[PDB]
Task: inverse folding
């Protein structure tokens, strides 16, 4: 019995086709992804193959103005139009709190939404009961397939789920549900979830009875053969795990941003054992036409985005100096504003051990692409912010040793004076440079804002300590020559869209007035 | 023909009786003021004297939780109960914008509200037309008296009137209105207004046809004889100005906070010339009973204040360190929070020459009387803030030369180490002390945030420059040994209530996390 699994993950609000690097589409003949093109390919496959499941492994929420304006209603609408068969909850599905999940998505989706390791308490438990499920048994052809969901246990540190949800260890929560399905004579089991490739491999190894793992979160690209685009595979597709019980369990993921459709064919025997599997993600490039009806619907929904983009978000009473002559040479108030917004976006529910889990931010000055002039009655719109931050990136959370962060600050000024983009703007960090010293030895003081303290204050950076830092995805991936960040980081989770982080902060503050205050000094 | 003028000014929300120093009443047998006691005295005088006008010279708004909760409705209600005959607009009547004046007060008062030098434009001009007036002609006995109002031209820098009101020079606006009254055969003219004693004397000298000036704003105490309490007279009551035309024009004011009722008897001839005048403010002490009916009404209205005082204003995720061991010895995050709130409260509509008119704050650490613990789910209530700031003061705007501010910072540490209250918390100021130097020579660096700049940044304090600084009224009056501030300041305007400044900021921010960030350092 042959099953075709089509799967997406970490689509992150890329409803419209994108450029090759998942930023805004500019040259249509070279654009990729989007839901209209996905529809064409899914429909084609469903014409030809009898036993098809279309699955999403989470993180449809967050990533473009679509999510800012429609807040998940676009996810329900377009996933319903595609006829997804099931979705697992990702961390970003909690970005607008549990109510921002229930109302736009759980109540509107025409497919089951799954997570076995999220447990509710208090009145919420009654309010949400049955709106997401630990698993669903789905009819496929003349057979049935069980799908058991899971969501990163780190979600409370990455999103805004509130204090009435408990995120249990994935393997601990999954095993009893898989065991239950076995007792109900469901012998074909897919684990669909949102914890990252490393956890996916552990689930494949340790959760007895799982036949295939369909994952997400880590934006992992897997491929068998020559890759079709610029993404570099982390492993073959599928990635085969040898389980504790000796079975071969395929693990799949399909990058992010709707650029690829995962495609896995599995051959099962009559007892539900995987005999073999093979496939590859399908690049959704311009050789696949956008479905005209979906495209027309997208264009209709875009009108409200255009309208929103020119509305006042808030006001500034200061010039927002995002000039290169400032931001590539010294502390600039636009950089301070953006870092302050990054930290504010990452205020998460703490225990008593930390005032907040993260206090620190770095931002390459070359990422700041425009000033904003305060003389238009102080108004700031989304369009103004999109001129400052035009790359379509995210502000991500990483863990870095102090030694790595010192190397990054040396890199920031190693060729100072040439208006290069690597000069760092900061938050929660006070740095002093002495440019008369040799490159590599110019950082003479580096103090950081504590997190494990009830009163935030600055102390010297410690070379062995691990620090949480918010920074652009561009830097987390080693852009601007920051190879030490890519190579030495100890954890990396994708964050919110850059423009939206700043827009939310401005709207919360209403009137902003960022100063240059001595975060960066020169001896 | 004899007229008795009863007058109040700068009552500032002191609806309930107060202590001798106008803070919260503690020992009832020694408390003073309040509207119930005022009612008793006004009613008594009106039984005995045939020709009485009860006038208010502005600034009923702002000063206690009464204003925070009732937003001016309490002013209309209790002034109506007293049967005020007229009121001039003060600067604080604009604290909640023009709409916060129109709705609670202008539309509800049963007496004319006056200002001849405020001109409206745009749609506001039609919306407000006739709701305040330049003057009113009032029948008194068998005669008539004209009352012409005025309001500080500095109101745009002191309050929130918006950009559709123009505050004209007082003398320029008053003269044509007084001239008009003369043509209507109104020969007895009172100028009632809110610009300060110095401007009141200029109006008396220069506005031809004004017979008596009843003022406010400067909290000026005038008295003929031995003073009855602790206020020190600035001059006799009335203060006699010799006008340009040779007439003797009495000028009166009655301190602030409802502690005194001004009382002036004027003898007019048949042509409306003042033959003589005499009087004195009446101390509203415990020898005058509180009117039982007004007192019972006050007690009924107080219930909603009690309820409000325990409601959550916002949250903190950090411990708010208002301990003396911190705030009298080093930078403390409670001090930073309070100074940040002070600056935020003083954001006013600027021209293009300044991002804001004021950027700088000082706060004596001895004025910070409690920490606030973040472990009660982060909640902050008014009652918590009242423990931090229990003195009933205001955060005022002053102009100080840099040399004066340097002397103040030397005073801040002149006997450092004894846990004395004069140690300064700051905003918009970065100070470095070297305590090994002699007292008086311990300030080694003092940088301040610019105002006449589009991008706020820090520069050295200049000894000759004049700076605007927000600070407690206690310091503006020379408390804590800061005699240089009292003696050398170049301007002083009373600001908003201390607790309300902080409560408004917390409610705007929703979640606060003030840090210790290097505003104060020691070599
Ligand atoms: C191969 C792709 C590189 C594209 S560059 C670029 N991508 C991004 C991005 N995705 N997120 C943030 N900053 C970026 N920048 C910044 O742009 C500067 C160059 O700009 P310029 O030519 O004006 O000097 C660089 O030094 C960087 O700091
Ligand atoms: C004659 C009236 C003085 C009353 S004192 C006082 N009034 C106020 C006030 N009205 N606004 C602010 N701070 C005040 N303090 C501060 O209180 C400290 C003494 O407190 P302590 O006895 O705990 O050392 C002083 O060093 C001051 O900084
Ligand atoms: Ca099986
Ligand atoms: Ca006259
Ligand atoms: Zn994601
Ligand atoms: Zn994720
Ligand atoms: Zn006043
Ligand atoms: Zn005033």
Result:
């Amino acid at each position: 019995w042959e099953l075709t699994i089509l799967h997406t993950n970490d689509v992150h609000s890329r409803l419209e086709q994108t450029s090759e690097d998942s930023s805004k589409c500019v040259d249509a003949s070279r654009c990729m992804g989007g839901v209209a093109r996905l529809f064409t390919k899914v429909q084609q496959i469903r014409r030809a193959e009898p036993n098809v499941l279309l699955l999403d492994a989470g993180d449809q929420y967050q990533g473009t103005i679509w999510f800012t304006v429609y807040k998940g209603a676009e996810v329900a609408h377009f996933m319903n139009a595609l006829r997804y068969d099931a979705m697992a909850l990702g961390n970003h599905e909690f970005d607008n709190g549990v109510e921002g999940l229930i109302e736009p998505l759980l109540k509107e989706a025409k497919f089951p939404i799954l997570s076995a390791n999220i447990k509710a308490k208090g009145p919420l438990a009654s309010q949400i009961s049955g709106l997401y499920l630990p698993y669903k048994v789905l009819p496929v052809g003349d057979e049935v397939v069980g799908i058991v969901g899971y969501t990163s246990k780190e979600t409370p540190f990455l999103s805004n789920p509130g204090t009435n949800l408990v995120f249990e260890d994935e393997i601990t929560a999954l095993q009893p549900e898989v065991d239950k399905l076995k007792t109900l004579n469901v012998n074909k089991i897919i684990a669909l979830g949102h914890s990252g490739f490393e956890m996916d491999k552990l689930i494949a190894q340790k959760v007895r009875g799982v036949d295939v793992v369909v994952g997400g979160h880590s934006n992992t690209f897997l491929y068998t053969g020559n890759p079709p685009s610029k993404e570099v595979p982390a492993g073959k597709y599928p990635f085969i795990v040898t389980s504790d019980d000796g079975r071969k369990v395929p693990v799949v993921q399909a990058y992010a941003f709707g650029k690829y459709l995962g495609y896995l064919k599995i051959e099962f025997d009559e007892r539900g054992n995987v005999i073999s599997s093979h496939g590859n993600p399908i690049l959704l490039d311009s050789s696949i036409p956008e479905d005209p009806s979906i495209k027309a619907d997208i264009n209709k929904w875009r009108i409200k985005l255009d309208d929103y983009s020119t509305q006042e978000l808030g006001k500034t009473i200061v010039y927002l100096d995002g000039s290169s002559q400032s931001c590539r040479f010294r502390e600039c108030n636009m950089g301070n504003l953006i870092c302050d917004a990054m930290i504010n976006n990452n205020l998460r529910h703490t225990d008593e051990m930390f005032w907040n889990h993260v206090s620190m931010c770095i931002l390459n000055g070359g990422g700041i692409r425009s000033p904003i002039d305060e003389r238009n009655d102080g108004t700031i719109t989304w369009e103004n912010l999109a001129a400052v931050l035009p790359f379509g990136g995210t502000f991500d959370l990483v863990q870095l040793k102090g030694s790595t962060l010192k190397k990054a600050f040396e890199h920031s000024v190693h060729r100072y004076g040439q208006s290069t983009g690597e000069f760092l703007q900061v938050g929660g960090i006070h740095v002093v440079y002495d440019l008369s010293r040799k490159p590599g030895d110019r950082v003479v003081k580096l103090d950081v804002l504590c997190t494990s303290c009830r009163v935030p204050s600055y102390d010297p950076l410690k070379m062995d300590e691990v620090y949480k830092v918010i920074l652009p995805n561009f830097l987390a991936n080693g852009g601007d020559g920051f190879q030490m960040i890519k190579d030495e980081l100890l954890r990396h989770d994708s964050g919110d869209q850059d423009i939206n982080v700043v827009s939310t902060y401005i709207s919360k503050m209403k009137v902003i007035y960022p100063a240059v205050e001595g975060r960066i000094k020169f001896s």
